[PDB]
Design a protein around this ligand. Structure first.
Ligand code: CL
Ligand code: CL
Ligand code: CL
Ligand code: CL
Ligand code: CL
Ligand code: CL
Ligand code: CL
Ligand code: MG
Ligand code: MG
Ligand code: MG
Ligand code: MG
Ligand code: MG
Ligand code: MG
Ligand code: MG
Ligand code: MG
Ligand code: MG
Ligand code: MG
Ligand code: MG
Ligand code: MG
Ligand code: MG
Ligand code: NA
Ligand code: NA
Ligand code: NA
Ligand code: NA
Ligand code: NA
Ligand code: NA
Ligand code: NA
Ligand code: NA
Ligand code: NA
Ligand code: NA
Ligand code: NA
Ligand code: NA
Ligand code: NA
Ligand code: NA
Ligand code: NA
Ligand code: NA
Ligand code: SR
Ligand code: SR
Ligand code: SR
Ligand code: SR
Ligand code: SR
Ligand code: SR
Ligand code: SR
Ligand code: SR
Ligand code: SR
Ligand code: SR
Ligand code: SR
Ligand code: SR
Ligand code: SR
Lengths: 49, 142, 150, 142
RNA sequence: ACCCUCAGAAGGGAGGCGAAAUAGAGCAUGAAAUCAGUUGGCGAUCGAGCGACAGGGCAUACAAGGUCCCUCGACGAAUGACCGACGCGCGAGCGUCCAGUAAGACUCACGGGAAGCCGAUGUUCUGUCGUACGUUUUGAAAAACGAGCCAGGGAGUGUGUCU
RNA sequence: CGCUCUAAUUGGAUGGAAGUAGGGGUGAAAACUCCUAUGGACCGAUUAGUGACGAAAAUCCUGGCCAUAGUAGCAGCGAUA
RNA sequence: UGUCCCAACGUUGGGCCCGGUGAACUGUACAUUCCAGUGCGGAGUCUGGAGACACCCAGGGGGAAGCGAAGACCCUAUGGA
């Protein structure tokens, strides 16, 4: 759930801004966002044997 | 009273006629810079080479003036490829034991930068006595 | 802050610095530029005349919208930045003071080196229309001066 | 005011464009040329159409400007400039070592360049730079 | 610490400590964007994808590259003469011989020379070519879309099953 | 080709490691390497692995910064001080 | 009855110059342009010419198919309400 604990939403078109989820004026959640989730991180379910 | 370099600094390797010819060729023909397209137009774009991929790329399309595109055709002659400009083939050396097996007539030695002064001193006096030139010698005031 | 950006022989030189001054950096570049090469006493007389309004300071770079001044030589735009000028009088007062404490004839020494550097900005905000606020900052200026025997 | 010309060309009864073409060729070869008696240079054709063309060049223009010369002096020089890359360094140098004169300010007589002479006994349809200038409104100072 | 300066517990100067204060307080290192000063090159008559490749100017402490230039000679691929002689053409010119000769890129040797001198690096000038990049598109320099600049961040990963 | 960490084999470093800046050499190239200054403690190579492994771009994200500019505003309201 | 013919003079606050304070919008790059042409047919940057010594102040806004807003029209989606 790392990076997913936020209700951040995108404003969509209109304010001359990229459609990036934001909260309190801060971008969040998405992988390209600082403090955003990891796109394809190490996973516990992986069989390493 | 002046600075002098340790070892066989002026030593030249002995090459076959053909190798001296090809070494002379490599040096005469040279090659283009081969820097990435438009590296000079944007500071965030470095010089390090990248194949131009743009569908409309002028360099990719081979338009004269947009710089040469890396191709096997630019390869240097096998017989001389990689040689120091002096003609010597270089041997990376980290200690005295690395000097063993090195032919001072065909190879010159290059002491890793990480090696310290103490160990360099031994490596340098041991290479000179072995007839091996040291490409990056220590300069001492004698 | 800055460090002197030029070497100085202590036996024939006196130094001085201003730190984090809250004054126009743009005015400082202009003033430094204008007094470099002058004698301390000349620089002082010059700056007092600027503050008095009798001598304009050429604005050769930060000149947008600046009105021309007849007394400006070899250039057109100039002004009378009295604030930054007073800061320079302090700097000169310090330099010449140090100069004399060392045995030199302060006032007579040449301003060998003088340059202003923007060391930072004191930040401020200003409310604006439509529920937004924008920057309203103060420049922070350091300036170095090296005096040298004639 | 004194012009050490290596060559002095006499344009009298000579086809302007042909002289121009040769004076340009020589100027580019480093020759300093002085074209003399420009008012007497000649251009073949029907006077009415010829004048209509030069009148159009005079009427053309706007704020940027299309300053076209009216004196045979300038007409001829402009004619030469059009045969020189006057905006390039070598071109401006060539052009600048060429001067045109009304009458002949020298003591020597100009020489007639081969292939540029017009035989008045064999031609009735041609005009004179001076005539063109007068029509254009120039002040016949020659 | 002490001293000097200053309206001054500020700041500055000098000084003391420490291997180091360019370790003096968001005080290990200290990139880029970028700013001040300054060095080299260009610069107030001249033209715009900012360059690539050639070749000139000016600039260059050492180290990590050591080559380069001219006479002559040797070798000498494709190509390839002048002149002279003879013969044709109205003419521009051509044929035969001289002759596949002289010449001919590279490379080498002798003799002489260069050390800002050769390479290289910075900038600038000349020549040739040249209307970014990525994307959308039949067609992009595009009056189609994206980016102010830089740094850092930023996209084929796991389980199960099948082949 | 380059990056991380693991292992085996094997080396470097306070007689100065990594990093950074400027510069020399090699490689078609990814990139490798040396010199000098800074730095002041760590750093490799080979082989077999491992993978939150490579950016110029997404009105991409965050931080920093320049031109804009010494510019607009610091006048306008029946309360002109 | 200055809405108009047809505009004038004046008043107050700005505007302009000076001290102090001091933002923002916008920025791929280059950029002194003009006339024609060419080009995805609506070019400061391509071609040909013309013109063009550098910098600065004030101005009204012709152009940058100016800036601001992933067209509210129209169509398309086995979209939403
Ligand atoms: Cl290969
Ligand atoms: Cl500022
Ligand atoms: Cl005109
Ligand atoms: Cl031209
Ligand atoms: Cl006739
Ligand atoms: Cl050869
Ligand atoms: Cl893939
Ligand atoms: Mg996170
Ligand atoms: Mg770049
Ligand atoms: Mg103004
Ligand atoms: Mg409100
Ligand atoms: Mg620090
Ligand atoms: Mg091994
Ligand atoms: Mg990265
Ligand atoms: Mg890409
Ligand atoms: Mg403005
Ligand atoms: Mg009142
Ligand atoms: Mg839309
Ligand atoms: Mg509708
Ligand atoms: Mg519905
Ligand atoms: Na939260
Ligand atoms: Na598992
Ligand atoms: Na300026
Ligand atoms: Na003046
Ligand atoms: Na004046
Ligand atoms: Na004619
Ligand atoms: Na005209
Ligand atoms: Na050069
Ligand atoms: Na697109
Ligand atoms: Na494009
Ligand atoms: Na277009
Ligand atoms: Na901005
Ligand atoms: Na944006
Ligand atoms: Na009225
Ligand atoms: Na306008
Ligand atoms: Na609805
Ligand atoms: Sr919309
Ligand atoms: Sr080292
Ligand atoms: Sr300016
Ligand atoms: Sr000719
Ligand atoms: Sr001190
Ligand atoms: Sr032969
Ligand atoms: Sr970045
Ligand atoms: Sr990644
Ligand atoms: Sr700013
Ligand atoms: Sr008031
Ligand atoms: Sr108001
Ligand atoms: Sr043009
Ligand atoms: Sr205006």
């Amino acid at each position: 759930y790392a990076g997913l604990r936020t209700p951040a939403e995108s404003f969509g078109s209109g304010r001359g801004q990229a459609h990036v989820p934001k909260l309190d004026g801060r971008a969040r959640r998405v992988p390209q966002a600082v403090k955003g989730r990891s796109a394809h991180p190490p996973k516990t379910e992986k069989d390493r044997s | 009273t002046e600075l002098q370099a340790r070892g066989l600094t002026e030593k030249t390797p002995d090459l076959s006629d053909e190798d001296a010819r090809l070494l002379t060729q490599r040096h005469r023909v040279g090659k283009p810079q081969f820097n990435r397209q438009d590296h000079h137009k944007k500071k965030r774009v470095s010089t390090s080479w990248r194949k131009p991929r743009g569908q409309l790329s002028k360099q990719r399309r081979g338009i004269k003036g947009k710089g040469d595109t890396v191709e096997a055709g630019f390869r240097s002659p096998t017989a001389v490829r990689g040689k120091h400009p002096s003609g010597f083939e270089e041997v990376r050396v980290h200690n005295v034991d690395d000097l063993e097996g090195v032919d001072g007539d065909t190879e010159a030695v290059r002491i890793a930068s990480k090696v310290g002064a103490r160990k360099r001193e031994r490596i340098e006096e041991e290479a000179e006595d072995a007839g091996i030139r040291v490409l990056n010698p220590t300069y001492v005031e004698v | 802050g800055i460090s002197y950006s030029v070497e100085a022989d202590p036996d024939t030189t006196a130094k001085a610095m201003l730190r984090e001054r809250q004054m126009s950096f743009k005015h400082s570049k202009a003033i430094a530029r204008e007094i470099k090469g002058k004698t301390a006493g000349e620089a002082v007389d010059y700056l007092e005349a600027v503050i008095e309004g009798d001598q304009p300071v050429p604005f050769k770079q930060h000149n947008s919208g600046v009105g021309h001044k007849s007394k400006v030589d070899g250039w057109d735009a100039g002004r009378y930045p009295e604030k930054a000028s007073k800061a320079f009088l302090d700097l000169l007062e310090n330099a010449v003071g140090n100069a004399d404490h060392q045995g030199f004839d302060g006032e007579a020494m040449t301003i060998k080196h003088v340059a202003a550097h923007k060391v930072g900005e004191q930040q401020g905000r200003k409310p604006r229309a439509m529920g937004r606020a924008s920057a309203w900052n103060s420049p922070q200026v350091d300036v170095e001066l090296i005096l040298e025997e004639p | 005011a004194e012009f050490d010309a290596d060559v002095i060309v006499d344009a009298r009864d000579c086809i302007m464009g042909r002289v121009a073409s040769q004076v340009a060729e020589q100027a580019l070869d480093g020759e300093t040329v002085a074209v003399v008696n420009a008012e007497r240079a000649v251009i073949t054709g029907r006077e009415e159409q010829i004048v209509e063309k030069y009148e159009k060049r005079v009427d053309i223009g706007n704020d940027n400007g299309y300053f076209y010369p009216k004196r045979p002096d300038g007409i001829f020089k402009r004619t030469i400039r059009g045969m020189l890359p006057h905006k390039k360094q070598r071109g401006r140098e060539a052009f600048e070592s060429v001067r045109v004169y009304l009458g002949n300010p020298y003591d020597e007589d100009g020489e007639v360049l081969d292939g540029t002479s017009l035989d008045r006994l064999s031609n009735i349809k041609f005009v004179t730079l001076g005539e063109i200038s007068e029509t254009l409104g120039a002040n016949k100072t020659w």
